[PDB]
Amino acid sequence: PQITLWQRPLVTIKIGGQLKEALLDTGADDTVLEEMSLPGRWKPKMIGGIGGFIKVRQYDQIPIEICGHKAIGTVLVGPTPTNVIGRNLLTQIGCTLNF
Amino acid sequence: PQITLWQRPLVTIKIGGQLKEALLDTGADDTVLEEMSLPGRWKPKMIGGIGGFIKVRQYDQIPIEICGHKAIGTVLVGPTPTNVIGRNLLTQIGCTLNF
Numbered sequence: 001p002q003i004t005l006w007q008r009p010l011v012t013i014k015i016g017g018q019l020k021e022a023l024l025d026t027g028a029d030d031t032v033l034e035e036m037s038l039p040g041r042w043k044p045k046m047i048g049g050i051g052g053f054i055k056v057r058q059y060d061q062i063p064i065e066i067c068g069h070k071a072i073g074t075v076l077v078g079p080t081p082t083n084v085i086g087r088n089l090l091t092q093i094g095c096t097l098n099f
Numbered sequence: 100p101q102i103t104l105w106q107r108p109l110v111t112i113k114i115g116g117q118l119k120e121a122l123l124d125t126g127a128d129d130t131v132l133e134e135m136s137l138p139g140r141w142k143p144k145m146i147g148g149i150g151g152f153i154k155v156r157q158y159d160q161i162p163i164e165i166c167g168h169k170a171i172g173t174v175l176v177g178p179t180p181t182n183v184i185g186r187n188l189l190t191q192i193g194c195t196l197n198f
């Protein structure tokens with residue numbers, strides 16, 4: 001698809017059996033989701049943006065589907081104000097900026 | 100250009116005659132730069148990110164070049180961790196997401 005930026009670039013993702021809305025976010029290194037359960041190991045991490053840091057749980061090798069596109073990668077879970085899809089998953093679906 | 104997302108999408112911008120580095124950020128509604136001087140009057144704005152809110156100064160109708168592409172619009176100045184070019188200016192330079 002070609003996604004305009006007149007509005008926030010929101011998409012539906014499938015993750016851990018759940019459907020969720022998330023923002024396609026080229027300014028995020030990592031994918032960060034609001035509190036949810038995921039299977040497997042995790043380790044604590046601090047991630048920072050505007051306004052400072054939050055503590056998250058880092059899960060590796062999580063399957064996700066974005067716009068019909070399957071990918072696997074690291075998902076950070078914690079008290080983000082909104083779900084963002086970061087570059088670590090945008091690359092996998094072949095997402096580019098164009099102008 | 101077509102910019103992939105394996106690395107941060109950092110580009111050179113020009114504002115007030117000076118070059119800076121900034122992140123092309125589809126997850127940002129607005130453009131927020133690190134402390135700097137701009138002309139005219141400013142208005143207050145609170146913007147929120149991952150770690151909470153910050154107060155910024157809002158300057159309107161500012162000329163800014165982004166990867167050589169000319170824009171004129173609203174620039175927020177405050178204690179952001181990194182310069183970010185948000186959708187307000189990404190739309191001016193004709194940027195889309197594509198996959």
Ligand SMILES: CNC(=O)CO[C@H]1CO[C@@H]2OC[C@H](OC(=O)N[C@@H](Cc3ccccc3)[C@H](O)CN(CC(C)C)S(=O)(=O)c3ccc(OC)cc3)[C@@H]21
Binds near residue numbers: 125146147179181
């Ligand atoms: C300190 N941390 C660092 O150095 C790097 O660590 C960062 C980078 O990668 C990592 O992944 C998750 C996090 O990334 C971000 O948070 N990304 C930020 C941009 C940004 C990039 C680097 C640092 C700080 C912010 C978003 O892409 C934009 N907005 C955040 C929203 C999408 C959560 S915004 O910035 O809050 C904002 C809100 C309103 C506005 O107008 C209204 C305009 C902007 C970590």
Ligand SMILES: [Cl-]
Binds near residue numbers: 089
């Ligand atoms: Cl990853």
Ligand SMILES: [Cl-]
Binds near residue numbers: 094103
């Ligand atoms: Cl590629």
Ligand SMILES: [Cl-]
Binds near residue numbers: 172187188
């Ligand atoms: Cl603007």
